[PDB]
Curated annotation (Swiss-Prot), chain A:
Primary location: cytoplasm
HAMAP family: SRP19
GO CC terms in record: signal recognition particle
Any one of the GO BP annotations: SRP-dependent cotranslational protein targeting to membrane
This protein's name: Signal recognition particle 19 kDa protein
Function: Involved in targeting and insertion of nascent membrane proteins into the cytoplasmic membrane. Binds directly to 7S RNA and mediates binding of the 54 kDa subunit of the SRP.
Pfam families xrefs: SRP19
Taxonomic path: Archaea, Methanobacteriati, Methanobacteriota, Methanomada group, Methanococci
Summary of subunit composition and partner proteins: Part of the signal recognition particle protein translocation system, which is composed of SRP and FtsY. Archaeal SRP consists of a 7S RNA molecule of 300 nucleotides and two protein subunits: SRP54 and SRP19.
Superkingdom classification of source: Archaea
InterPro entries in UniProt: Signal_recog_particle_SRP19, SRP19-like_sf, SRP19_arc-type
Keywords, sorted A to Z: Cytoplasm, Ribonucleoprotein, RNA-binding, Signal recognition particle
Family affiliation: Belongs to the SRP19 family.
Swiss-Prot record, chain B:
Protein EC: 3.6.5.4
Name assigned to this protein: Signal recognition particle 54 kDa protein
Sequence similarity: Belongs to the GTP-binding SRP family. SRP54 subfamily.
Keywords: Cytoplasm, GTP-binding, Hydrolase, Nucleotide-binding, Ribonucleoprotein, RNA-binding, Signal recognition particle
Subcellular localization, as worded in the UniProt entry: Cytoplasm
Length: 87, 403
RNA sequence: GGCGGUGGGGGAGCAUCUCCUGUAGGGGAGAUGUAACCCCCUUUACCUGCCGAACCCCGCCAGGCCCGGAAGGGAGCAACGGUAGGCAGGACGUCG
């Protein structure tokens, strides 16, 4: 699957792509942040620093692809939880 | 009525862009553009022509020739479809002074007695004082559905529930309500279900007035038959006749009805929509289609179709043209990509520009960050490529200058 | 001449939130808020014309852009059409 930064951007809005609720919604999501998370979770992700979400077609926001066959919604919740707690 | 606008826009729809028309894809629309029409009970014979004038037009002399591809056929259909529903003659005159005289008629089972009231509340807003005169017999309910109306408004009316007649119960109100009458509508249409009789009662009362307009209140529902009524009317009214077709919500057939009245030269000046005086706008073709085809109406093609002529008038229009201007450069790239700034650099400049505002193209200094980044984002390019256009421009302009 | 432009209801739609969903674009279901489209009721609060805020106002979205192997779908700028809001006339209402 693909994970677009916009899913979990506390700043962006729902229509602008968010999928996790306010709680879990990291401020300024980075691919690093993302990549890293899925690693702790036993996944093997790859970054594409130069892809764009149609919804913000004008901005290279990149995404990270993982091969996972489970709910995306809760992976997403899964990734945000890991990110709020970060030393 | 609405299903026409329904089943119809489903063909303009078909025209997307994906696989640009070979020269037949047009046909796959026609056969159905037309069946929307037939099914919308339009006089077949009218439809089959309609279908031909798209052939001999848009798979012949066609070519993006004009506002590009799909846009065109989606334009030809329109410009023609309209002419079907009526050329143009909605100009319902008013009152050269302070006194006119409109005559209302129309077979029984129409909206003639109501269309009376309605028209009164049309001119009201047009800016005139209309009075009504029940110049015929009415049913003991018709009085419970008219006066009330004339009360919904200020419109005074002369009705006869006591003793009655016609050519005098019409004279008095005439020589009576004048103490404020700017316009005078006369509800005289006897209760006839048949036109001939309609046109006889109507004359006895055209000798007692010098009408400015005679109006026929036909009926959508009546479908295409509405037009065989239009003829006997025009063929009897010295061109002072004008149709009013109502009940454009109570029937599948009806849009097929105007086309009938539209064949007859007789002009359509008003139309029905509902029952409340509100939804009762004057008839103007182009508009009706805007409501019809939905989407982006008529005026939606007077900048990208007006700036494009034979190119030997435009290509040379700018030959004397020297002074610069952003729409003027757009006008130059529009002769460099064509009629032979690398290719890709010619389309992108034309792309960026094609996303600025008249205000911005006209004398373009007002452009800065916030705007740059909107043209540069609405067009698909980078803030840097819009600055290159500005540059280029601001250079060709300094350069272009004297004689 | 002056001065004035009314309250609302219904649903589409849109904005923001919440929930589920599809190994991209996406898709379903709701809450709240609404001017914009449709229709009704009330009112003098309506007409005809030109303007309207570039974009953080609506529709419509050409091109161009994005995701996609495609099919197709997204975001959306001009233009165009509208809101809020203005300049005229005109008519309705008032003269407190």
């Amino acid at each position: 699957m693909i994970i677009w930064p916009s899913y979990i951007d506390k700043k962006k809005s729902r229509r602008e792509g968010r999928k996790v609720p306010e709680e879990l919604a990291i401020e300024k999501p980075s691919l690093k942040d993302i990549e890293k998370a899925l690693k702790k979770l036993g996944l093997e992700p790859k970054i594409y620093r130069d892809k764009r979400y149609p919804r913000q077609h004008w901005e290279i926001c990149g995404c990270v692809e993982v091969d996972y066959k489970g709910n995306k919604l809760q992976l997403l919740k899964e990734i945000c939880k890991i990110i709020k707690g970060k030393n | 009525m609405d299903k026409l606008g329904e089943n119809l826009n489903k063909a303009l729809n078909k025209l997307k862009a994906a696989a640009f028309v070979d020269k037949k894809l047009i046909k796959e629309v026609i056969k159905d553009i037309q069946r929307a029409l037939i099914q919308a009970d339009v006089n077949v014979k009218l439809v089959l022509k309609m279908s031909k004038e798209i052939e001999r037009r848009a798979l012949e002399e066609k070519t993006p020739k004009g506002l590009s591809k799909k846009e065109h056929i989606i334009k030809i259909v329109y410009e023609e479809l309209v002419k079907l529903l009526g050329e143009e003659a909605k100009k319902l005159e008013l009152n050269p002074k302070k006194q006119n005289v409109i005559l209302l008629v129309g077979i029984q089972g129409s909206g003639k007695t109501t269309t009376a009231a309605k028209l009164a509340r049309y001119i009201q807003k047009r800016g005139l004082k209309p009075a009504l005169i029940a110049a015929d017999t009415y049913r003991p309910a018709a009085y419970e559905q008219l006066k009330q109306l004339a009360e919904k408004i200020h419109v005074p009316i002369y009705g006869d529930e006591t003793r009655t007649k016609s050519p005098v119960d019409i004279v008095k109100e005439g020589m009576e309500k004048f103490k404020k009458a700017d316009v005078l509508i006369i509800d005289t249409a006897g209760r006839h279900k048949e036109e001939k009789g309609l046109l006889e009662e109507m004359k006895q009362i055209k000798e007692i007035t010098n009408p400015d307009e005679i109006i026929l209140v036909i009926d959508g529902t009546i479908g295409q038959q509405a037009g065989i009524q239009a003829k006997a009317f025009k063929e009897a009214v010295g061109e002072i006749g004008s149709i009013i077709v109502t009940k454009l919500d109570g029937s599948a057939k009806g849009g097929g009805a105007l086309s009938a009245v539209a064949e007859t030269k007789a002009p359509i000046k008003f139309i029905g929509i509902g029952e409340g005086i509100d939804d009762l706008e004057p008839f103007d073709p182009k508009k009706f289609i805007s409501r019809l085809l939905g989407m982006g109406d008529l005026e939606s093609l007077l900048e990208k179709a007006e700036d494009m002529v034979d190119e030997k008038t435009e290509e040379s229009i700018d030959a004397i043209m020297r002074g610069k201007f952003t729409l003027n450069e757009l006008m130059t790239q529009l002769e460099a990509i064509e009629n032979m700034l690398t290719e890709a650099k010619i389309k992108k400049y034309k792309v960026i520009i094609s996303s600025m505002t008249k205000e911005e193209r006209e004398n373009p200094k007002i452009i800065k960050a916030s705007r740059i980044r909107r043209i540069a984002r609405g067009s698909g390019t980078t803030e840097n490529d819009v600055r290159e256009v500005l540059r280029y421009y601001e250079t060709t302009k300094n350069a272009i200058d004297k004689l």
